[PDB]
Design a protein around this nucleic acid. Structure first.
Ligand code: CL
Ligand code: MG
Ligand code: MG
Ligand code: NA
Length: 326
DNA sequence: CGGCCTACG
DNA sequence: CGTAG
DNA sequence: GCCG
């Protein structure tokens, strides 16, 4: 009744198993901090299955036959059903390793490998990192300076104001170019921790060279607190009553021939896209990325004019963005 | 057992 | 190494 | 950690 890949089922943003999924996601996150990508994937997939169920799990019986529920994930759910807490989850939550790796990897410019090295060196707090700035890249310095603002979610209201400023710069850089909101906000989130925009132009080729022209214009408007092509990972100044705050914004350019693939990829969720690419390759023998869908036997790229085309190519029922919250 | 998404900066 | 979803 |  429940298919094995997340791209085969609808997953809404809000659901009926929030506490269970959150606990499994703690274990997934902790597996990532230890470099166990396989365990991370299993716990993420198990959490996602619960998000896709039509009602709450109330009894252990109800996990029988669900994909990605084995001894370990079932025990976690069992303990939550019986006691309201899972001892393993709570031990992770309180652990110095989990808490420090979570804090450090939240910094823009710091991944698991850097966080782990700092942890092994004995560093534990952001102020520890600030006291050794020669150990930091320019990107990490910006991430550390702006960390407090970047830790506070932005609202859809904020997103709409940002989009107008990006559109103004894009229109000067290339008249006729368009700006599409992607990421979690396109999946229906009312808040989120960064904003993603996808930029194209209806005449194939006209988008070449566009992103530098857009960045220069936003920089000259004083809106860019940090930037480093077709992807730009920025920190922008967002107005606030009587002041402003830093916000992470990603800007991506695609040619219109690739736009449906880029839209699909950048709309996420992350798990949904990994699952969709896995399904494409393993079940259909086709290779998917944010630029296209390749048949390696015929050595040809599928043309798509819409996300609907891509789901059809892959033999999957169409899911709107709001149902891609795997 | 092998596999676990696939890119760009 | 970082970033993205 | 789980699936095929
Ligand atoms: Cl693993
Ligand atoms: Mg996002
Ligand atoms: Mg983003
Ligand atoms: Na980070």
């Amino acid at each position: 009744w429940m298919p094995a890949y997340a791209c085969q089922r609808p997953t809404p943003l809000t659901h009926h198993n929030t506490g269970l999924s959150e606990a499994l996601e703690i274990l997934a996150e902790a597996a990532g901090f230890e470099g166990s990508e396989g365990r991370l994937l299993t716990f993420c997939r198990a959490a996602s299955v619960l998000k896709a169920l039509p009602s709450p799990v109330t009894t252990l019986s109800q996990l029988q036959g669900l994909p990605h529920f084995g001894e370990h994930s079932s025990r976690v759910v069992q303990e939550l059903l019986e006691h309201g807490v899972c001892e393993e989850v709570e031990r992770v939550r309180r652990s110095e390793r989990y808490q420090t790796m979570k804090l450090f990897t939240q910094i823009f410019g710091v991944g698991v490998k850097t966080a782990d090295r700092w942890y092994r060196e004995g560093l534990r707090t952001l102020d520890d990192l600030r006291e050794q700035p020669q150990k930091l890249t320019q990107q990490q310095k910006a991430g550390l300076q702006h960390h407090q603002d970047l830790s506070t979610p932005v609202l859809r209201s904020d997103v709409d104001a940002l989009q107008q400023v990006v559109e103004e710069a894009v229109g000067q850089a290339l008249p006729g170019a368009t700006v599409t909101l992607t990421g979690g906000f396109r999946r229906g989130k009312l808040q989120g921790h960064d904003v993603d925009f996808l930029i194209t132009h209806p005449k194939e080729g006209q988008e070449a060279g566009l992103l530098p022209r857009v960045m220069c214009r936003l920089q000259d408007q004083g809106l860019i607190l940090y930037h480093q092509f077709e992807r730009s990972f920025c920190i922008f100044r967002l107005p606030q009553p009587g002041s402003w705050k830093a916000v992470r914004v990603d800007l991506v350019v695609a040619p219109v021939s690739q736009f449906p693939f880029a839209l699909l990829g950048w709309t996420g969720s992350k798990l949904f896209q990994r699952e969709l690419r896995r399904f494409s390759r393993k079940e259909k023998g086709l290779w998917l990325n944010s630029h296209g869908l390749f048949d390696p036997e015929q050595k040809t790229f599928f043309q798509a004019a819409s996300e609907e085309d891509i789901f059809r190519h892959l033999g999957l029922e169409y899911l709107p963005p709001e149902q891609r919250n795997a």
